[PDB]
């Protein structure tokens, strides 16, 4: 209602400041960082890379990130707490399930998954005492049966705690409509929900219609735009063919439609990525050397020069995330 | 050959004693026990159940078990160390990959996987310093391209270290001939390989030809039987429709063919199982209350009653596992 849980404990809403609402310290798999830290050079090297990256974002104005790495993205909340303390950047951790659930998760009922998401919000993650402040879910296509169980569990956990739900939309086909239908069938308010990766489409009438229904629209992959990398087969299905300015103009378009309050922006960046081909992190870092500072260093000035006023940009990067993250029923 | 790695440190061959070569403390998924221990009631409840069960096996003569839980079966070597020490039963831990590799494993090359298995054998598991003493691999059907990479990396790791390889197939499946092809193409000696779950069929021709090639034959699911549970589809799918006596008669058949030295016997038991339907452990515990003591309490007397000499049975339960586990380049 007024305090948000972070990996260093509770903070008040006013302390969050400029908040990147969809980021990762490391995109990995459950148990992997512990079992094979040398994949990333070392745990130390990954930690140090993340502390520099977060200090760079901080110098560019960022005060909070939301790490939307779930259990099955290899979330290590102890790593997050360490790099949060060393960078002096708040990190909100997530519960939920992404697209790589192991069997022990895939074979669970909606009731069982609700208890798991609830334990991570109400009690803590693992034995750390660190509580999730957001629930992350993911869909592909028209939403599979298991993904629908996960969305319903996420809705039920949200209804019991007030923490919001944020999604990974992996579809070339108005992928939020089915997510909205499932959330609404559960009695969840759209204002507790961010439909993420909404910048992957140019379908403005679709985005506007979700915003008018009260959903938050995550324009959160703005720098995933590889202009010149058609020699790499795997760099096209993880970056793209539309320019970053094209994606950023969706922000202006929704503002002009009257829905600035429904917009959340971010980079979807990370400092390590083992859940993809080897050396992918080198390709990503060469295409976007700004990392998580891309939003404040590139996108905010781009929008300013297009005529968006300062107060509107503050509304999007400070006010909207605060309203979204503060637990509410 | 050499001393054997256990979760309490190196032991000599002579200390292994009566060894069960395919067992589990808990069948789960990477990260799962630490993220959701109350799935098993609690971590402490699971540890206490394991210690009670191991102590009953110990009373019945068992001195060593080989826990062939891999990374992706949720191996928690600190759990293994706790219950080994409290039950005072040696436990050999495993590296390798089973049938639920996350993205961070299944997008790796054969060289990368070789390095991961080597790390777990030569350096230690996670940050524990506990080294694996066996490499566990698993296949479905034909052997998939990824599974074939896993088998080649396991062979290379075995060649570099002398530690043996042991395998899983699905219910009623064979698969040994397809696995042996790959292992021999890498130059691995059959004397370093156990073709596990070989009690899943009654194809004696298949079993005897692998044994004649020097493979170890794992007759290691002896108590698994859903006979009398025909209305429970999940129990039947898991435990199968063959009696424990049918499975045990394969031990006698291979002895009768002259292959006593190729035989390894076990229960493939566990004290928790989250990588299957909920409450399955209740079904399994009612089928086989003896747990891991099933082999010494029931199968050994069964085979004695069939006329097999005590010395042959001692060779199978003590000498064969010692020859198999002792690292041999
Ligand atoms: C954990 As099993 C029943 O696949 O050996
Ligand atoms: Zn995503
Ligand atoms: Zn993401
Ligand atoms: Zn198995
Ligand atoms: Zn097994």
Summed up, what is this model?
Two copies of one chain form a homodimer. With 329 residues, chain A is α/β, with parallel strands linked by helices.
Structure description:
The structure is a homodimer of 329-residue chains. Helices cover 42% and strands 16% of the residues of chain A. With 329 residues, the first copy, chain A, is of the alpha/beta class. The first copy, chain A, has a single domain (1-329), classed as Metal-dependent hydrolases (TIM Barrel, Alpha-Beta Barrel). In chain A, the strands form 4 sheets. In chain A, strands 7-8-9-10-11-12 form a 6-stranded parallel sheet. Chain A has a 3-stranded parallel sheet with strand order 3-5-6. Chain A has a two-stranded antiparallel ribbon with strand order 1-2. The longest helix of chain A has 17 residues, at 43-59. Chain A binds chain B through residues 28-32, 34-36, 38-39, 71-72, 74, 100, 102-105, 107-109, 112, 116, 119-120, 125-127, 274-278, and chain B through 28-32, 34-36, 38-39, 71-72, 74, 100, 102-105, 107-109, 112, 115-116, 119-120, 125-127, 274-278. The site of one zinc ion has 4 residues of chain A, from loops. Chains A, B: The modification N6-carboxylysine is found at residue 136. Chains A, B: One of its GO terms (molecular function) is zinc ion binding. Chains A, B: It is a peripheral membrane protein. Chains A, B: Zn(2+) 2 binds at residues 136, 168, 197.
């Amino acid at each position: 209602g007024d305090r948000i849980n972070t990996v260093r404990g509770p903070i008040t809403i006013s302390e969050a400041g400029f908040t990147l609402t969809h980021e990762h310290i490391c995109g990995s798999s459950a148990g992997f960082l512990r079992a094979w830290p040398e994949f990333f050079g070392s745990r130390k090297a990954l930690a140090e890379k993340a502390v520099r990256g977060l200090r760079r974002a901080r110098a560019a104005g960022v005060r909070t990130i939301v790490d939307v790495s779930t259990f099955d993205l290899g979330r290590d909340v102890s790593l997050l707490a360490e790099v949060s303390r060393a960078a002096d950047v708040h990190i909100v951790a997530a519960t939920g399930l992404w697209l790589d659930p192991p069997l022990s998760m895939r074979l669970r009922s909606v009731e069982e998954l609700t208890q798991f998401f609830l334990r991570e919000i109400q009690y803590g993650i693992e034995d750390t005492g660190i509580r999730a402040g957001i629930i992350k879910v993911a869909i592909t296509g028209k939403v599979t049966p298991f993904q629908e169980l996960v969305l319903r569990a996420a809705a039920r956990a949200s209804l019991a705690t007030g923490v919001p739900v944020t999604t990974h939309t992996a579809a070339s086909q108005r992928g939020g409509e089915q997510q909205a239908a499932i959330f609404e069938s559960e009695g969840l308010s759209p204002s507790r929900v961010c439909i993420g990766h909404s910048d992957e489409t140019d379908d403005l009438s679709y985005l506007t219609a979700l915003a008018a229904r009260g959903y938050l629209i995550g324009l959160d992959r703005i720098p995933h735009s590889a202009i010149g990398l058609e020699d790499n087969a795997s760099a096209t299905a993880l970056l793209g063919s539309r320019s970053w300015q094209t994606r950023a103009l969706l922000i202006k378009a929704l503002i002009d439609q009257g829905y600035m309050k429904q917009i959340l922006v971010s980079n979807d960046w990370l400092f390590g990525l083992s859940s993809y081909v080897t050396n992918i992190m080198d390709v990503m870092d060469s295409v976007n050397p700004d990392g998580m500072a891309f939003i404040p260093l590139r996108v905010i000035p781009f929008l300013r020069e297009k005529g968006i006023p300062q107060e509107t940009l503050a509304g999007i990067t400070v006010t909207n995330p605060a309203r979204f993250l503060s637990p509410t029923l």
